[PDB]
C-alpha cells in the first residue's frame, strides 16, 4: 500500500521574484526608473 | 512568515497521523507476535494477556487521536472569514416622507407658520 | 511629522482574500486615488544634496474630480512633499522618516516649481484603500501609470501583468523630540503588526 | 469544494473510522470463532484500506486547508460599527413606528 509537493516550495520563489520587484517599484516611486 | 505557519502546522497535523496510524497497526501487528500458545511457559503467557488487552486500548486510543484531529480540521475550516456581510429582514423599505412630516409637523407643534421667501 | 510607514507584499492571486479580511477588522476601506507628479531640481556645482528623494513630491487628491475634465491639472487641490531618508540601521523596529505636508491655494499651482527653477521629472498614480486604527492608517498602493503624461483617462498603465498590492502601514508622529508620543506611535503599530501579521508579513525597509 | 463544503467531505470520512475497530475484531474472529486463515487473509486483506484510505484523505484534506491559505491564527474582529442591513433595519423600525 502507498505511504507518505517540491511546487509549493517553489511558491516562495514566487514570493522571492514579488520582492525584488517590490524593490524595483519602490525605486520607481524614487525615480521613475524602469 | 505566513506561508511557515501553515506549512509547519501541516507538518503537526501529519506527523499526529502518522503517529496514530502507525500506532494502531503496530499495535495490532505485535498481537500475532503475541498471538503463540503451545511451547510457552505458563507463567510466560499470563503477561501477554495484559499485553494482548494493552494494546487494543492503544488501538482504541489511537482511533480517539484520529477523531481529536478531526475536530481540528473543522475548525480551522471555520475560523476562515466570511465572504460577505450576511442577508436580513430588507423587506418594507421604510418611507422618507412620512418621517419628515411627522417631524416637521410636530417641530410646528402650536406654531403659526407663515411661508418662507427669500 | 516624523512618518512610521511599513511595507508588505501582496501577490494579486490572492489579493481579494486580504481585502475581505481587513474590511472585516479595520476601519474603513476608504477609496485612494490620487496623482503625483515631481518636479526635477537642476542646478550645478555641489553641494546640491541632488537626493533621489530630495526630488520634490506635489500630490493631488483626483479620486471625487471627474475623469473628463483635462484642466484639473491646476483647478484640482494640491499639496507639496519631501519625505527624508528612513534612519540608518533601522531594523525589527519599523523605519522612520521625516514628512512635511505642505498644502497651497491659488490658479497658480505647478507654475511654481518653474518658478524655483524646477521642471517636469517622473510621475505615477497611486490606487488603493486606507483603512484607519485611532491614530495610525494604513493603505494599499497601485501604482499605475497614466495613460497620458496628466491625464486621467482609463485604462491607466500597469507596470506589469501581474502587479503586486504595496501594502504600507503608518503613523505621523507630532515631532521627534518627544519619546512618550513615540512610545505611544511605536505601541499603536505594534498592536496592528500584530493584528495583521495574521494573513500578511510586513516588515521594516530601509529608505 | 469551497467553505462549508470540504466540512462535509469530512463527513463522508466520519463514518468509516469506527468500523475499523469492529472489523479487525472481525478479522481476529476469523483465526479465534471461524477458525480460517483464508477468510483472515479475506478481512485482512479489506481491513487494510479502511486505514490507508482514511489516512490519505486526512493528508490530502490537510493538504486542502493549506491550498486554501486559512490563516493559522483567528483574527480579531474589529467592532464592526455599521453594516448596511443593519442600518436599513433600524430604519425599517423606524418607519414601523412611523
Given at each position: 500500500?502507498?505511504?507518505?509537493?517540491?511546487?509549493?516550495?517553489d511558491?516562495?520563489?514566487?514570493?522571492?521574484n514579488?520582492?525584488?520587484?517590490?524593490?524595483?517599484?519602490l525605486?520607481?516611486?524614487?525615480?521613475?526608473?524602469? | 512568515?505566513?506561508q511557515?505557519?501553515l506549512?509547519?502546522?501541516?507538518?503537526?497535523?501529519?506527523?499526529?497521523?502518522?503517529?496514530?496510524?502507525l500506532?494502531?497497526?503496530?499495535?495490532?501487528?505485535?498481537?500475532?507476535?503475541?498471538?503463540?500458545?503451545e511451547?510457552?511457559?505458563?507463567?510466560?503467557?499470563?503477561?501477554?494477556?495484559?499485553?494482548?488487552?494493552?494494546?487494543?486500548?492503544?488501538?482504541?486510543?489511537?482511533?480517539?487521536?484520529?477523531?481529536?484531529?478531526?475536530?481540528?480540521?473543522?475548525?480551522?475550516?471555520?475560523?476562515?472569514?466570511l465572504?460577505?456581510?450576511?442577508?436580513?429582514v430588507?423587506?418594507?423599505?421604510?418611507?422618507?416622507?412620512?418621517?419628515?412630516?411627522?417631524?416637521?409637523?410636530?417641530?410646528?407643534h402650536?406654531?403659526?407658520?407663515?411661508?418662507?421667501?427669500? | 511629522?516624523?512618518?512610521?510607514?511599513?511595507?508588505?507584499?501582496?501577490?494579486?492571486?490572492?489579493?481579494?482574500?486580504?481585502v475581505?479580511?481587513?474590511?472585516?477588522?479595520?476601519?474603513?476601506?476608504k477609496?485612494?486615488?490620487?496623482?503625483?507628479?515631481?518636479?526635477?531640481?537642476?542646478?550645478v556645482?555641489?553641494?546640491?544634496?541632488?537626493?533621489?528623494?530630495?526630488?520634490l513630491?506635489?500630490?493631488?487628491?483626483?479620486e471625487?474630480?471627474?475623469?473628463?475634465?483635462?484642466?484639473?491639472?491646476?483647478?484640482?487641490?494640491?499639496?507639496?512633499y519631501?519625505?527624508?531618508?528612513?534612519?540608518?540601521?533601522?531594523?525589527d523596529?519599523?523605519?522612520?522618516?521625516?514628512?512635511?505636508?505642505?498644502?497651497?491655494?491659488?490658479?497658480?499651482?505647478?507654475?511654481?516649481?518653474?518658478?524655483?527653477?524646477?521642471?517636469f521629472?517622473?510621475?505615477?498614480?497611486?490606487?488603493?484603500?486606507?483603512?484607519?486604527?485611532?491614530?495610525?492608517?494604513?493603505?494599499i498602493?497601485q501604482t499605475?501609470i497614466?495613460?497620458?503624461?496628466?491625464?486621467?483617462?482609463?485604462?491607466?498603465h500597469?507596470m506589469?501583468?501581474?502587479?503586486?498590492?504595496?501594502?504600507?502601514?503608518?503613523?505621523?508622529?507630532?515631532?521627534?523630540?518627544?519619546?512618550?508620543?513615540?512610545?505611544?506611535?511605536?505601541?499603536?503599530?505594534?498592536?496592528v503588526?500584530?493584528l495583521?501579521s495574521?494573513?500578511?508579513?510586513?516588515?521594516?525597509?530601509?529608505? | 469544494?469551497?467553505?462549508?463544503?470540504?466540512?462535509?467531505?469530512?463527513?463522508?470520512?466520519?463514518?468509516?473510522?469506527?468500523?475499523?475497530?469492529?472489523?479487525?475484531?472481525?478479522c481476529?474472529?476469523?483465526?479465534?470463532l471461524?477458525?480460517?486463515?483464508?477468510?483472515?487473509?479475506?478481512?485482512?486483506?479489506?481491513?487494510?484500506?479502511?486505514?490507508?484510505?482514511?489516512?490519505?484523505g486526512?493528508?490530502?484534506?490537510?493538504?486542502?486547508?493549506?491550498?486554501?491559505?486559512?490563516?493559522?491564527?483567528?483574527?480579531?474582529?474589529?467592532?464592526?460599527?455599521?453594516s448596511?442591513?443593519?442600518?436599513?433595519?433600524?430604519?425599517?423600525?423606524?418607519?414601523?413606528?412611523?
Amino acid at each position: 500500500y502507498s505511504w507518505f509537493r517540491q511546487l509549493e516550495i517553489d511558491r516562495a520563489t514566487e514570493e522571492q521574484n514579488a520582492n525584488q520587484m517590490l524593490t524595483d517599484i519602490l525605486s520607481f516611486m524614487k525615480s521613475g526608473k524602469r | 512568515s505566513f506561508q511557515r505557519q501553515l506549512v509547519q502546522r501541516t507538518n503537526t497535523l501529519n506527523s499526529s497521523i502518522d503517529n496514530a496510524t502507525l500506532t494502531i497497526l503496530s499495535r495490532f501487528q505485535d498481537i500475532l507476535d503475541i498471538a503463540i500458545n503451545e511451547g510457552k511457559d505458563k507463567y510466560t503467557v499470563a503477561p501477554e494477556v495484559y499485553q494482548i488487552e494493552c494494546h487494543t486500548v492503544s488501538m482504541v486510543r489511537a482511533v480517539e487521536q484520529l477523531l481529536d484531529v478531526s475536530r481540528q480540521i473543522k475548525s480551522y475550516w471555520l475560523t476562515n472569514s466570511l465572504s460577505t456581510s450576511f442577508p436580513t429582514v430588507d423587506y418594507s423599505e421604510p418611507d422618507l416622507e412620512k418621517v419628515k412630516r411627522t417631524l416637521t409637523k410636530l417641530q410646528n407643534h402650536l406654531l403659526e407658520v407663515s411661508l418662507i421667501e427669500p | 511629522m516624523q512618518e512610521l510607514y511599513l511595507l508588505g507584499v501582496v501577490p494579486s492571486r490572492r489579493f481579494e482574500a486580504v481585502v475581505n479580511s481587513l474590511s472585516k477588522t479595520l476601519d474603513g476601506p476608504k477609496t485612494i486615488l490620487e496623482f503625483w507628479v515631481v518636479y526635477r531640481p537642476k542646478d550645478v556645482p555641489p553641494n546640491l544634496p541632488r537626493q533621489p528623494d530630495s526630488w520634490l513630491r506635489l500630490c493631488s487628491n483626483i479620486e471625487s474630480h471627474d475623469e473628463t475634465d483635462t484642466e484639473w491639472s491646476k483647478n484640482t487641490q494640491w499639496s507639496m512633499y519631501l519625505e527624508g531618508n528612513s534612519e540608518p540601521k533601522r531594523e525589527d523596529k519599523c523605519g522612520i522618516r521625516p514628512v512635511n505636508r505642505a498644502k497651497l491655494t491659488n490658479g497658480s499651482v505647478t507654475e511654481f516649481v518653474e518658478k524655483m527653477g524646477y521642471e517636469f521629472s517622473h510621475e505615477y498614480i497611486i490606487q488603493g484603500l486606507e483603512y484607519f486604527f485611532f491614530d495610525t492608517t494604513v493603505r494599499i498602493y497601485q501604482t499605475l501609470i497614466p495613460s497620458q503624461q496628466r491625464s486621467i483617462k482609463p485604462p491607466f498603465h500597469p507596470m506589469n501583468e501581474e502587479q503586486p498590492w504595496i501594502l504600507h502601514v503608518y503613523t505621523h508622529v507630532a515631532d521627534a523630540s518627544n519619546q512618550v508620543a513615540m512610545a505611544k506611535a511605536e505601541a499603536n503599530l505594534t498592536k496592528v503588526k500584530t493584528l495583521l501579521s495574521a494573513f500578511c508579513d510586513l516588515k521594516n525597509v530601509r529608505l | 469544494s469551497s467553505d462549508t463544503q470540504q466540512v462535509q467531505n469530512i463527513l463522508e470520512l466520519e463514518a468509516k473510522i469506527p468500523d475499523i475497530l469492529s472489523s479487525a475484531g472481525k478479522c481476529i474472529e476469523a483465526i479465534q470463532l471461524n477458525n480460517s486463515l483464508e477468510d483472515f487473509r479475506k478481512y485482512s486483506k479489506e481491513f487494510l484500506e479502511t486505514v490507508e484510505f482514511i489516512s490519505t484523505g486526512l493528508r490530502r484534506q490537510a493538504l486542502e486547508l493549506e491550498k486554501a491559505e486559512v490563516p493559522v491564527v483567528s483574527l480579531q474582529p474589529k467592532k464592526r460599527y455599521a453594516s448596511t442591513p443593519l442600518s436599513n433595519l433600524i430604519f425599517d423600525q423606524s418607519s414601523k413606528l412611523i
